[PDB]
């Protein structure tokens, strides 16, 4: 008796994390079922970099990681290697040698409310870009001008986060999209197929 990876808890989770605070789940010591991944739902994006989906069953990985977050459709093109933008630079950056998969699906029926669902946030400004798989969760005000800021919001001092006003009538590009990135570590390997 050897349990299976908790992929349903990741994909079929009731609520997803904000992109700035993307959630991560380590997947070790299990036997993964990738068949249930494809045809259990309809995804609007399924792209794998450096790995083959037919050979996933025939490969054994040491440490798998399932990152999850929510963004708008327009930004789904930033969850890939060597991409730039607000999401790729200040929220979730994937390395150039990414060896994994990126899945994403529309979620306007859960993550958008009439009048705007402002619970999902994203970072606008940082002093620097995010290293690959780095998470910044700080809420210190951003110094956007020559005048330093003293923990008080004001002229040229802005809060680093902003809310996605996800409405059910928005355009498909501005609608919420749940994203799941499967990273594959290679190094005793406790994951298989």
């Amino acid at each position: 008796i050897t349990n299976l990876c908790p992929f349903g808890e990741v994909f079929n989770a009731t609520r997803f994390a904000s992109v700035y605070a993307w959630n991560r789940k380590r997947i070790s010591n299990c036997v993964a079922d990738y068949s249930v991944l494809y045809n259990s739902a309809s995804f609007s994006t399924f792209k794998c970099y450096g790995v083959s989906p037919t050979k996933l069953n025939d490969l054994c990985f040491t440490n798998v990681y399932a990152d999850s977050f929510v963004i708008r459709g327009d930004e789904v093109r930033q969850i890939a290697p060597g991409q730039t933008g607000k999401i790729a630079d200040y929220n979730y950056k994937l390395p150039d040698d990414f060896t994994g998969c990126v899945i994403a699906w529309n979620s306007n029926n859960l993550d958008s409310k009439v009048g705007g669902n402002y619970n999902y946030l994203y970072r606008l400004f940082r002093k620097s870009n995010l290293k690959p798989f780095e998470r910044d969760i700080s809420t210190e005000i951003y110094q956007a001008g020559s005048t330093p800021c003293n923990g008080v919001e004001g002229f040229n001092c802005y809060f680093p986060l902003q809310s996605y006003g996800f409405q059910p009538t928005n355009g498909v590009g501005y609608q919420p999209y749940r994203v799941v990135v499967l990273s594959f570590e290679l190094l005793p390997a406790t994951v298989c197929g």
């Epitope: 904000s18 705007g116 619970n119 946030l121 809310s163």
Partner: nanobody, 121 residues
């Protein structure tokens, strides 16, 4: 309107502990993320802790991380800050901050009156 009413917080002994609470009343916030601030006499307003209520994610600045902790009670609209091993440096006024969003999405901040806490021998 909105009003953050802060209770708890008085006089403590160095090395002691203390729990502050803050209760919001008024219009429900478009976002669930709050924080505590600390203004010492002769210093600027400092960030002590911030909690995201939509998520289970907390943020503490490097000044005080392993000593203070922030929690929330969503049903009661309460937010708490427990401080342990309090030192004389911690003497200050602690303020409540409830963040909201405008139609544009830019986040602003509602403030509470603040409660004073002093750590003297």
């Amino acid at each position: 309107e909105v009003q953050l009413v802060e209770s708890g917080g008085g006089l403590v002994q160095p090395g002691g502990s203390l729990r502050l609470s803050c209760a919001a009343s008024g219009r429900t916030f478009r976002v669930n993320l709050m924080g505590w601030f600390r203004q010492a006499p002769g210093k600027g307003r400092e960030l002590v802790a911030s909690i995201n209520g939509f998520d289970d994610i907390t943020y503490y600045p490097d000044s005080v991380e392993g000593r203070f902790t922030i929690s929330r009670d969503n049903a009661k609209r309460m937010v708490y800050l427990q401080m342990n091993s309090l030192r004389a440096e911690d003497t200050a006024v602690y303020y409540c901050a409830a963040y909201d969003s405008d139609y544009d999405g830019r986040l602003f901040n509602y403030w509470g009156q603040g409660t004073q806490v002093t750590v003297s021998s």
